[PDB]
Amino acid sequence: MVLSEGEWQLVLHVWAKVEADVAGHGQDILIRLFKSHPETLEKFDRFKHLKTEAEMKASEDLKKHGVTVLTALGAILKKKGHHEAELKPLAQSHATKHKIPIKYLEFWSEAIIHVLHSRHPGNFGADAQGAMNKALELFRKDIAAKYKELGYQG
Ligand code: HEM
């Protein structure tokens, strides 16, 4: 699958807004993920102890990870499809070290879409959400292909 330039423009336009507050968006997205699919939290030995949303919001450690995650995702999105080099190490660490099922990657995509829709309604209408979903599906498809090559189900 390939996104059109018009689709990439919609994706990068809303991403530019996300970049005005990377730490805040990182926090919102991770918390959304954990609240919607609590089982994902078990994969983070570093955050498994957090019991409430209040504790998550206060964790400087969780905020730091959110920044790291969004910065990596941003670098990938800006490649507009030419992300093979950036994807390799990420696929390897998540398949071999962290052991993240492809199913959890879908939950992740859901969380990002929910937060963008909540914080940027004006720049995240139907067309823009469709473009973002397509970009995230592209990423998931490529990561899934790499998982297989690396010897991990998904
Ligand atoms: C767009 C998808 C995602 C991106 C871009 C992303 C990115 C990253 C990055 C950059 C790191 C640090 C470097 C590394 O270890 O490779 C990381 C670590 C990690 N990721 Fe992801 N990640 C994604 C999805 C997920 C999901 C869905 C889970 C599980 C629900 C997950 C679990 C982990 C874990 C357990 C670590 C280690 C955290 C620590 O202990 O410091 N990641 N991820």
In brief, what are we looking at here?
Pfam families: Globin. The chain has 154 residues and is mainly α.
Structural account:
This is Myoglobin. It comes from Physeter macrocephalus. Nitrite binds at residue 65. Residues 2-148 form the Globin domain. Helices cover 71% and strands 0% of the residues. The chain has a single domain (1-154), classed as Globins (Globin-like). It is built from seven helices and no strands. It is mainly α. Helix 1 (5-18) packs across helix 7. The structure holds protoporphyrin IX containing FE (HEM). Residues 40, 43-44, 46, 68-69, 72-73, 90, 93-94, 98, 100, 104-105, 108 line the site of protoporphyrin IX containing FE.
Features:
oxygen storage/transport, 154 residues, mainly alpha, binds protoporphyrin IX containing FE, Globin-like, monomer
Total domain modules: 1
At CATH level 3, the topology is Globin-like
Question: Largest sheet, if any?
Answer: none
Number of helices: 7
Strand % is under 5%
Q: What portion of residues is helical?
A: over 70%
Shape: globular
Bound molecules: protoporphyrin IX containing FE
**What is the chain-wise order of helices and strands?**
HHHHHHH
Give the terminus-to-terminus CA distance: 20 Å
What multimeric state do the chains show? Answer: monomer
CATH second-level architecture: Orthogonal Bundle
Number of strands: 0
CATH superfamily: Globins
Return the structural class.
mainly alpha
What is the CATH class name? Answer: Mainly Alpha
Radius of gyration, whole Å: 15 Å
PDB class: oxygen storage/transport
Keywords: myoglobin, ligand entry and exit pathways, oxygen storage-transport complex
Assembly: monomeric
Entry title: Myoglobin cavity mutant I107W
